[PDB]
Design a protein around this ligand. Structure first.
Ligand SMILES: CC(=O)N1CCN(c2ccc(C#N)cn2)CC1
Ligand code: NA
Length: 123
């Protein structure tokens, strides 16, 4: 149907916008602390602590499968990256501090993204 094609165009468009957001958020992690999943070879007990791991590479896979239906779903995953880190690592670590900085600097990008999604009407 034409409707299904229209839908897929918007989803494709949403994906295009979120790819830009994802690149902007990742730039706020210059140390690449959040670029890849936490290594279960290096941190063998990680899943005893964190039940829903997330990282930028995994977000990117889902993004390219057009697996984010709306901005809220994308934001949930971003929040998992930060929130997992701020629980696993103590306040006086480079890891916790990197998450705080990513949270604070990312809020700007995400505030804008929410306005653009609403405005251009991508869902
Ligand atoms: C982002 C995050 O929470 N991480 C947990 C702590 N972490 C570690 C810990 C121990 C070893 C070793 N060997 C390597 N990396 C980096 C990833
Ligand atoms: Na903690």
């Amino acid at each position: 149907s034409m409707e299904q094609v229209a839908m897929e165009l918007r989803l494709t468009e949403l994906t295009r916008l979120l790819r830009s957001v994802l690149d902007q958020l990742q730039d706020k992690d210059p140390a690449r602390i959040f670029a890849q999943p936490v290594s279960l070879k290096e941190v063998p007990d990680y899943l005893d602590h964190i039940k829903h791991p997330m990282d930028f590479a995994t977000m990117r896979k889902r993004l390219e499968a057009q697996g984010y239906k709306n901005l809220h779903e994308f934001e949930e995953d971003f929040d998992l990256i930060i929130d997992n880190c701020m629980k696993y690592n103590a306040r006086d670590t480079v890891f916790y501090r990197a998450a705080v900085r990513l949270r604070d600097q990312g809020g700007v990008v995400l505030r804008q993204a929410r306005r653009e999604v609403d405005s251009i009407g991508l869902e």
